[model samples]
Target: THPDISVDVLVIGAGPTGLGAAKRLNQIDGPSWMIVDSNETPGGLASTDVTPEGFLYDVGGHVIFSHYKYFDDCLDEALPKEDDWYTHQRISYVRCQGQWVPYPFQNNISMLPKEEQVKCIDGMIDAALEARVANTKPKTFDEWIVRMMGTGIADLFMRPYNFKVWAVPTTKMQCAWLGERVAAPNLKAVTTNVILGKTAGNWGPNATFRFPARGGTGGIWIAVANTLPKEKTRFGEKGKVTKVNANNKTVTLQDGTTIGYKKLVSTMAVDFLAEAMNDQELVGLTKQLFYSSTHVIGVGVRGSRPERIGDKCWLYFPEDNCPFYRATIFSNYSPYNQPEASKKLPTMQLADGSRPQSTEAKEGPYWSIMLEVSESSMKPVNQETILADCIQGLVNTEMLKPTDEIVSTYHRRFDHGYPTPTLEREGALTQILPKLQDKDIWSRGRFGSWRYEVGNQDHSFMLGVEAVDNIVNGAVELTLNYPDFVNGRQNTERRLVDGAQVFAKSKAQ
Candidate 1:
């Protein structure tokens, strides 16, 4: 039998969370640490997928819209050179009533038909009037929608569009997750834009974001991993955790090695971690936490980027014409997202699902659309025919012509894609997380914490960073405990390049 390995800190899942923890541990130089992940590479859900034909697609759509200065510093350090990233101004729209409506669709009703615009304005006017007299907070997401944008916009866009994205009705979801994710239409701006025949200007934090120039979305994590000592990290089959003995404070890897740690930071879904620990109570509590599966479908087509689709980054579909709720122009994010225009490829099929005239290889110019389809108990999807159905939907939605050639295709289903903020979510997280922390197990990440409000790249990273600080020095975890506080402002308290501050051990220890 081999000897047991031990460390002061054991970080699990080398995605943004685990990597975030390890980065801090290494910086502090006060804790002996090791990070492990089952995936051969980093960037878990934030990772990229490659088509057999050489196109690239992110898990869904991902962009760096940092809310923390430290997050910006680490990524900048990872991809240091000026040429490492690309900055893009978000060009987005919603497909409604056979037209492209500028995004924050409720605010840009001017782009809609005059009849439809009047309906929206009438509803907004009612909402404004009602708000002045209302004395209570909206209870559900649906109520929040009507209270903020009125019933007209709700019936037209918010209701349908959100149902498509969340895979759950707005009433079934909670409104707590809507800090900065949704835009509240300004009555004056909407009316002015409608009268002037113009669209609302840029709105929201991600209006301008940065992306890696070369590695799809995954490149950033891989580069971040490289900054740490190679031997301190374990990935692939050897790194997979099979069992957790909270009593003994050791984790057994798939390779039969048991690593002991004084403190554990697990970035995997809490449900999975609970199962690994074989804790019945934790598993039972997880039942109350609901989530939605995500189906990411990518289609690469042969031809120059069409004029009608010019410069548009992503588009939303609330109509039945498309099974997908959102579609991103993946190729628009970066030139390397797809194979070069000169790379030869054979047509797989026509946009209408008809066979190509010839099976011969062709070259020059291509583009891609990445679609997201949500699934849950309430929302079922036909996986077998979704690819073909989506291609047909593209035609019906006018995103593609019937004659367009389909050169490559990609489809992957992520089971725990979105962490649904149900009414019970806050209650469940309150009990489950504190119980885990009592066992010296810090469960934190996108799916780990199960809070969609602070579940973006920046928030997830800071969740890990704060978790380590809490373990090391009894520091308060601002991101985890106070989502509204962090989301409402820029966090500049930490820095990657700054000298290490003294980290005293937790008082309890």
Candidate 2:
């Protein structure tokens, strides 16, 4: 028997973006729609992976910092109740010269030694004077950082740290993506703080965020999937999509099941989506869309939370003391982030590369940490030593002691993890997205759209939601076309059940 199906709308990729589209479609209460994912569950990069020993790790370091009310509403609907979430004040630092510099290292140069502090202050003064006389804008991220924070801060922290995070050099990236993601110090304030030996508070929107109570980040998406009609959704793991005929609007599954749709919303990476379509023109265009791979590593320590670590959420590493660019205190996010101390797990190794002396079982609470390493041809990494490097980094950064018991370890690589904002990114996306849409297919999501400015879970979800709105009602997508505008102010269009505005308005561009 030939399997036949039809829907008003077909949504692909069950990550936050796909779910967002499905949620909005359900809310509008209009044409019939179905959502699907290659994975059995949702969450995409925002999802969590578990170590064999029960330690959980998210892709890189995902934290909630939404700019859309609909996004907040969806999360609330998915994980309602106070106990369903865990909130924490963001504690972060930058490791430099064997010392921990409070994050936004440019704004807190007072902590640096005298000579370094002097250099930073001098650059800040020079930059202030330059800003007063300059008429033209800086061309690249590197220039923008130097101009705004001065050579001192840029050279000390911004350049190296960003390179590690993006897996691409700052010179290759555009400054437009740096709206509020990067911190710029007030010259007067920074100078005064440095002279008076003062430091600034935590920065960035996710200074505080909420985490799911169970199943790590993936738990939230699975619960979200439960909210929808299960019959309308299919997990591609059972029958992965092998072919897509954009002209006929038909998708062929690995099991030879063909699903047809009038409108197709794909959340897979644009490059992969093009390849699946088997379109020579699109495949060539996709080759221009560059990206990097990511390696997520989790380490479970069999000791009480360290006093030195405190409540630090995530720490940055620019120096080559370790392979990882960032590390998150997994245990600090939620108690369920790690296995119970009573759960007996054998030791993997000691912190200092020695086998644990007592391979004995352990018993009240255990803490875990996760680290992320970025890789590309531009930033090659030693895959063999990455796990060891991360553990050494934990010790180097004082997160663990030499004799700390390591009970669990995990390391996995994800291709196409981060879409690089190369010098040619905007130009390529502007052409590719519209070109694909002309075929009656909307390619959208974190890597689908490939715009880092709108690549967070909330932004990715809203992109899908907005795509549906445009298809159904021609609604304006504030997140996609106007990221700078969205990031500038409080967006108030959508409202949460509590009636608080979720999307903030972007200040005047």
Candidate 3:
């Protein structure tokens, strides 16, 4: 070998996390680092896929709501102008009993049937009384749900909806993963809302989010990667990491090149990394971590945006009628999400899958909806008919009429979709991560660390940045170790404008 690559830091997986590491390393301009990803694209799980007919669907629904100033600044720099983004207030609803109920469904029982409202209120009163005497913390997610919102809401909404989202029974999962993600219902306020026939206000951090004007959510990361030195980044077969020999601090890529490094920041699923490293102990420890697969289905219909759909951002389905847990009005995010009105696309079939009367290519406008279906051993999905099932689900949910002409369709499944917060996750990570770190390996990302509490794009990106800080300067990894602390407040220590000056002068804690 003439000269194999040698870098101070070898970053794997060019998703947000790897790109983040590359960005920070580039900014510091100190460490000789190289970033590698199996996929040619910059965004990993957060990437978007475009249908042949030109409809764009993200891996799932990705909304930008930052908890850190550095994340915001980096995004700002990448997109730069206001025209690059379209900010929207979250207009979300839950489909209940053929009616659209405002989100945080527990607090909006007013929208529910009067009989259902009574049941929820009665349960809330009972839960409140029980809370007064209760002294211990809830162990499982199910118990937490019942204690917080009562069995009525739990049965009707939380239980069914969460099962659809996580593809796991609430009882099997831990409650620690939920920080500010879940909205806690106020007992008195909920009762008043029901009595007064008023719905609750918008809730959660993602009440308003920004999206890229083009290329869906993936556009953001590609632009962020463009800010880095082109030579340092590698994609495709050459970038694909085949093995990681931690003992010698070397990585073997698909191109049969061995790259030596001082520190390794791996963003691949840790289980996959364990296999690559051929570390049997790490593999056994990773067995305790659980995750679900995500099936993202998209439907593009020819015509103007439906009145029923209106300006709705996303809708939740808690009923059995729909196979999808959530449906995002992908077109509402940006005009570029779908083909222009003039871009002709033939009607493949009607929503019912029957042949269209006229298969001729036509124009005007097209709107798209992206649906998410989670799958696990506990809840299996029929991959063969998932697309068809999703279309039927849309029709059953009244999102699409049987007569609506379906012009474009998309279906993709990610094996490692959601990093589940199982009961044994913390215990496993406590050992797995430390052992890897001792070998100069930092396994961090959505599935890498397997902590859903901090698995969002923002957190994943910061995980890489913090990992770099830990390796280079021995700084405390706040996002990895203290998810609640990082999530509770805005992280303002690092700024893009200050460059390496702030990083050297200040500590993240």
Candidate 4:
């Protein structure tokens, strides 16, 4: 290895955001660049994990809702085949009072019991009336819930479900990051639905989404990584970043090699980057930016896919009967999500405390459920008993009967999983990120830039794409600085397929 390595752009962490930056750098062909990831594989949290028994699990529930043509074009470049992905309707529901409430729970209260329905409608009326006369904005997420959904639905679903998702109290969160997260129920439509026992149509922007047919979501990023030049990328222990000397525009990798870069596109967590740089002040500021850890549990069952759970995509659990905030019917995503029906796998255990009925290895059909549980300093988790607790939760929530055979079970915890939209976030990021940018380092991505409002796979990729434009031509980072604009607007201002001229328009603007 060379004692010193240098590039036009040294992208840190080859996740979606890093890969996006590297892809753009490669497309332009003017910059000598390299992308490095600590893992041997390229996908970061966007990566997928496979079990010994041949079941696959993603970091959490990473679904795509494309906001830019550029992100679509990048995936097209990676996996261009028509059969590369499987598209499905987003058949989701919330488990409430033993009944499945269609997603956007507030808008579908008609499914609730008559008394509960009245409680929700009453609250919505109050909220609507208040909105007509209210002049001030909501101060906290809790206030937003009351103002937008009202107290009844908040107590029923939003508060409890979000508590499990963010691992932070609703009062502590800011309302500004609630873009695309909630759908404000149309008063007239909701009222008529409640009266007529009807439901709002389940068709919207993300009503139909696509998933990679074979490798899980990580396969998309890996394929995206494949399109880049191998010589210009590094992964594994040799690529692990040890320290950064921004003063000298160099990053020291784990192997003690220093890489100098004209500009750095970092997709690692902001706190991790701050620690590597030994920036005491930046670390102190980042401490204010709250985050939650995610515990992903995948259970593979050996049996015919249950008719009760047929065609369901994702289910939410707000009740204490379940530890997971959400569960995905992973096997429904694709035939390859689980081992073929022909493969034999021994039963791990039943859902109950009792032992399995048999130790035989047999399979005719298989199905899988992937669950997500969140944790933070404020809301800690017991890792030792989590798996057993989750199994019990499956039984409690009726997802599995006590005697159901669990062919395979997987549990892994990811720290810095979900970036919380705490009240302190905007203030800290407004000050901290630009300080690193002054040193030619741009921190962007899920936990890198740390804006959950625009932190999906699509948003994360664009964060890196826009960061590159900013470095090359001093352009506006719409995804990073203007989250609201990017979230709501149909962005066609720049197209990667059009070549280098995309940067010229941003430069001219």
Stretches of candidate 4 off by over 4 Å are 1-3, 201-204, 499-509
- Candidate 3 lDDT over 3-101, as tens digits, reads 298999999999888887887888777789999988888899888888888888898778999998989989999999989999899899999998999
* TM-score between model 3 and native: 0.97
RMSD for each of the candidates: 3.2, 4.8, 2.8, 3.0
Cα displacement (Å) at residue 170, model 3: 0.8
Candidate 4 structure quality by residue, lDDT tens digits, 68-153:
98998888888899999888888988899989998878889989998899888888889999999999889899999999988889
In candidate 2, what are the lDDT values of residues 1-509, reduced to their tens digit?
33377788998888999988888887766788888777886778878888778888888757887787778888898888999998877788878887788877777888888888888888888999999999999889888988898887788878888888788889988888878787878988877887788888667887768888887778888888888888888886753677899988888887777888889999988888889999998888888878999999988888778788888888888887787888888888888888876788777789998977777676636888889999998889888988898888888777789988888888899998888888888878888888988988888888889988888888888888889988998878778888899877776676433221121223332
Q: For model 1, where is the 10-residue window of minimal lDDT?
A: 499-508
Candidate 1 per-residue C-alpha lDDT over 1-509 given as tens digits, one digit per residue, 9 for 90 to 100: 43379999999999898889989888888889999999899999999989889999998879889999999989989899998889999999989898899877877999998899889999999999999899999889999999999999999989988889898899988897787888888899889888899987488887899889998879999999999999999999989999998978999999899998999999999999999999999999998899999999999999999998999898899998889999999889899988898899999899988989998898959999999999999999999998888889999998999999999999999999999988889889999999998999999999989999989888888899999989987999989988999888878878875544433434335
Per-model TM against the reference: 0.97, 0.95, 0.97, 0.96
Relative to the unseen true structure, what is the C-alpha lDDT of residue 419 in candidate 1, on a scale of 0 to 100?
Answer: 95
Q: Which 10 successive residues of model 4 have the least lDDT summed?
A: 496-505
Query: Which wins on lDDT, candidate 2 or candidate 4?
Result: 4
lDDT of 4: 0.87
